[PDB]
Design a protein around this ligand. Sequence first.
Ligand SMILES: O=C1[C@@H](NS(=O)(=O)c2ccc3cc(Cl)ccc3c2)CCN1c1ccc2c(c1F)CCNC2
Ligand SMILES: [Ca+2]
Ligand SMILES: [Mg+2]
Lengths: 52, 234
Amino acid sequence: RKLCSLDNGDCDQFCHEEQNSVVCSCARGYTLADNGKACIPTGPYPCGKQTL
Amino acid sequence: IVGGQECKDGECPWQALLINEENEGFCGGTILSEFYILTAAHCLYQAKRFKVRVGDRNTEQEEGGEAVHEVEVVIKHNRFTKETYDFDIAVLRLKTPITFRMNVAPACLPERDWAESTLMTQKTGIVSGFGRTHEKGRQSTRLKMLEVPYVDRNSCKLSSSFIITQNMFCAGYDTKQEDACQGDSGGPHVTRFKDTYFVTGIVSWGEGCARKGKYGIYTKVTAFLKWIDRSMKT
Ligand SMILES: O=C1[C@@H](NS(=O)(=O)c2ccc3cc(Cl)ccc3c2)CCN1c1ccc2c(c1F)CCNC2
Ligand SMILES: [Ca+2]
Ligand SMILES: [Mg+2]
């Protein structure tokens, strides 16, 4: 298990392997956090979250 | 939904219900955005004129979250085949935008490769709807959800008296009495990942409901990600 194969590459959401390194990204309505892994909602009612 | 549980408050906010002229649900849908609903192409032959209802968990009481939306455009997959239900997918553009609130929120569209490698390899997905609670029963007045295991593609092909195209996948159980059913068609099959729910399928068809040696057959949403994106730009 390597990169995206190992625990989703530590990404909250999408994991891609560009070169031989993990690249994380997020669904629309989320921005990648400063650590380059977590996905932060841009606004209220982001997709995929149960309400409250 | 045969078996499973009630969707509790806020639990299935992406659920949409296609309602006929008599305000009766005949199919489900998934909220993709303020303007778009994902559903099954086969649902578009079950009613002449229909609307979409969101924010509803109990069709017998007003809960304060219900909203009815008229449909501006029906975008059906042109390769949809009634005999096989291949390409069983459609997108609906609503006339007015859905206002997200408690019990009303979209499910996320995943990326194809990641979904196939990471979501579809999870043990289970979640199917939801107002469909029948047993094969010969009536439709549920309560929105239900059900955890459905992903089923091995070969086992599913072996179990099916009908072709399973590249655009379908199977989920549910061999013998356990849990499955989607009549009226759940067009509805969400979502997969949970780190408390985030991604749409992975569309309730398509089954040889009855919850029958032994039979599984639920769902449109493989990941095969249609580019198509959905195109349909959502017009
Ligand atoms: O979908 C259903 C059944 N209708 S249902 O309302 O009971 C129904 C509809 C959708 C379902 C979806 C899932 Cl995931 C599970 C059970 C379902 C059950 C009756 C027979 N049937 C069916 C069987 C085989 C085939 C098709 C069917 F519709 C279409 C494509 N060709 C094969
Ligand atoms: Ca209600
Ligand atoms: Mg079965």
